[model samples]
Target chain A: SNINYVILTVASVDFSYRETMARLMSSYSKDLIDNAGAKGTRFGSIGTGDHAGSLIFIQFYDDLTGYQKALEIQSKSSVFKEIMDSGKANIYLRNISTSLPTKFEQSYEHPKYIVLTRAEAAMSDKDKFLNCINDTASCFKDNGALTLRFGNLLTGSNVGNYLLGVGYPSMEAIEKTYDELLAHSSYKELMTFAKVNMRNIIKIL
Target chain B: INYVILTVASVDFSYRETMARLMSSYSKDLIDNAGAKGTRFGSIGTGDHAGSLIFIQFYDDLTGYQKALEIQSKSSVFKEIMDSGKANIYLRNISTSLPTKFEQSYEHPKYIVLTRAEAAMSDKDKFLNCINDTASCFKDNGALTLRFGNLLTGSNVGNYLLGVGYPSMEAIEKTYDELLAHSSYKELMTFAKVNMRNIIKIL
Candidate 1:
């Protein structure tokens, strides 16, 4: 069965709340997903990150058909209720939903930081976007990266136009790659590289 | 009270002179109308990459930067000045650090080294610890003036960039003299050699 990739984004406003939220999703909210026919679930903290809000939750299901039932199971779960009871955690589930046919790229014992680069290539700029993506993937591959995954939607999807995740040990390593990218001719060809949303690795079934 | 925006450009040699002139005129406009603390425009005087141009300006912070970009972005003269100068340009790179880091209290920086690097290890925490320690070392030592910036989407992925400005370009040789003799620098080079040999220096 084709695996479905889902993401739930929320605001982890406070420093203390960031970790508190992570615990709920990473530890507290496990069965809520599995019982819903989910392969599994994982949560990543942006902890003062640049985005609509710093907190992002990611989940994977057997396939697209199974997502609703999986999400429905949460309605009766006390765990879900308790986490959302707080006004801060009180986010509508569908506020942001990313459903895609995700592909597996790299894995390691210690995948440091997973950066989710949300960007898209318009039809007219497809070649330009793909070239930039390939150049980035290639550079990361050569720079001791653990994983590089790229996925895009064919028609309808809530996620950004495309998603590229690169796993690295240090943000510095990532920044360094971005600098070298300064040297790439392809990076400049893209017309819309500025629009960004925003990373981490820990996938599920 | 001090935040500096540093831009280094590789204007195609043919256009270097005109670029410098336009930069001079535009920089003057910024100083007179904009809230720029001060600005300087010049070309590399004597490095192997001598013809490249450098533009350094100061602003309060995000607001100041935004005002400047807004002013420049919407202005045709600014665009014309930039476009005309860069029309034949092969390389027009901006510092990803957004602005270079400096201690604020110095005159025109004598020399600056733009350092960009990728991490070679898999242990992220350990690597960051190593880098933070390195940052502390640089900040503590007066010899190595480092302005740090990260390369973003427009640049390479998974790379970190920072700048180190050595005061007093009068002699050029005088800039790194104290740094080369320092014991702490040796320690830094030791760390650099092991974990981050793949560095791109925009010197």
Candidate 2:
């Protein structure tokens, strides 16, 4: 797969049929993969995080030509009409973004709880700025998070910033993490320190 | 004080999600006046009947559901949403086995399973007895926290609506599986075996 473009769809099951949702979501993806020559489509239910009822659909393509062609094909496809008209999905929001595929691309296993946060890059040394942001990754890990992925947003309102995603097995893990996070003065001070830096930096700007 | 309405209905969900969000933000006044103590919404994510989204609301008595419906019928928003869909209304009465009323509990429950069936007209008494008896079994055996009841009325003319709840999806599956495997459930389920549309929900 020469994956270069991706469409990320965040949806809640219209009612609560994750199984049918999975079948329908994958069915659409499977069609796209076959007829459209797309690399692949990935799907998962929001196990826990900001509450459940979220199904994430990601479709990968080799390039913009492939991505544009897939959309054109889907727009004209009767199969697309069938799925949309069938009332099998409640796709609330769909996001299309450029990509940099990682080893974590197929790391779609458990610890399915996703924490999606958006924060900008503070003007500073590029490497040092990222290292500070990456610091939070360890914070998530120390709190029982299974895996974390940090990526830059290429477009939309959050364009130019980045999204930090953390995963966990259950919401309880996150609940407990916050419980300790609030109690730990070290984490609190570190957070405040970042805020103070951002404050002063913005003041100078 | 424990009130119930286990309603199964279908609508354009991709369309309704917008309404769901709009209602989530905009419906406080309507809800406060909707003539019910509380109302909750759910959708079937995937399974046998893919499009069903159930609404379970509370009233002080069995009659409260009717009162609420009267109030609902007058609302344009309610009318529009209902007009767009087909409903299987189940007017339920909370059984005595569950101690708490719907009012006091505010825990957004994680799982709600609606098992629908109708009683034989002649065997209504025996049917109700078996229903309560099974709740008693779950209560006594600690299968899971449960609330069992019957639909006094319906568009489809069903006689019963059995609702069970679980804190976890794993519990939802296991508890119902155990209840079905249990001996006491036989009589109750036997009466309800006809046209059972088991609507499962994950909150």
Best by lDDT: 2
Q: What is the TM-score of chain B in candidate 1?
A: 0.56
Each candidate's fnat, listed in order, reads 0.00, 0.00
**RMSD, model 1, all Cα superposed?**
14.0
Model 2 chain A: lowest-lDDT 10 consecutive positions: A196-205
| lDDT tens digits, residue span A1-205, model 2 | 4336656676655433555656655667777888778876657644322323356766667777777778887787765676678776667777655544333322344544444544455435334435554544445556676655444556665565544455565544654554554455554434332322000000000
lDDT (0 to 1) per candidate = 0.49, 0.52
Worst 10 residues of 1 chain B by lDDT: B193-202
User: In model 1, how large is the Cα lDDT of residue B137?
Assistant: 42
lDDT of 2 by residue, B1-203 (tens): 36565555554423556557534542453357655666667665323343356666766665765666676667666666656553443333343222422222345556555555556767756765665555544444223444545555445444455566545544533454456456656656455543343334442
TM value for model 2: 0.40
Candidate 1 segments whose C-alpha is farther than 4 A from its true place: A1-3, A12-14, A32-41, A47-53, A92-105, A108-110, A123-136, A153-160, A185-205, B1-56, B59-79, B82-203
